[PDB]
Design a binder for this molecule. Structure first.
Ligand SMILES: *Cc1ccccc1C*
Ligand SMILES: [Cl-]
Lengths: 12, 115
């Protein structure tokens, strides 16, 4: 959604 | 389940990184994601991800299906230690139970229901 996106999962 | 990531990174380097990432982001869990051998669906460009502890398996399925452009008729399964985790489980719950001694959780994905 607005928070749980693909980029949310990316290693920092 | 053989993860290529372990060939690429020795245990002590993984473990040190996993300890640090848990301290920096305690509401996230570090995950190595690889395609199961011989699966006939798309590839990611990375293996190492840092996911919210409260993300569910089902939400992760949804994101992968859209990321790799799966067709409706394509299946998608996860395996942790050769077993499909519950769709309702959170990443944090899977991490608590199944994380390895390097502090990472290891997930394989496939188009088949047997690893
Ligand atoms: C949506 C969310 C929740 C917790 C941590 C990170 C992100 C992207
Ligand atoms: Cl985003």
């Amino acid at each position: 959604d607005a928070v749980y996106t693909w980029e949310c999962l990316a290693w920092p | 389940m053989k993860f290529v990531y372990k060939e690429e990174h020795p245990f002590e380097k993984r473990r040190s990184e996993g300890e640090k990432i848990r301290k920096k982001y305690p509401d996230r869990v570090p995950v190595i994601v690889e395609k199961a051998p011989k699966a006939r669906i798309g590839d990611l460009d990375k293996k190492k991800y840092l996911v919210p502890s409260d993300l569910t398996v089902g939400q992760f399925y949804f994101l992968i299906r859209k990321r790799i452009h799966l067709r409706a008729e394509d299946a998608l399964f996860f395996f942790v230690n050769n077993v499909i985790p519950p769709t309702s489980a959170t990443m944090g719950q899977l991490y608590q139970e199944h994380h390895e001694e390097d502090f990472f959780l290891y997930i394989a994905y496939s188009d088949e229901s047997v690893y």
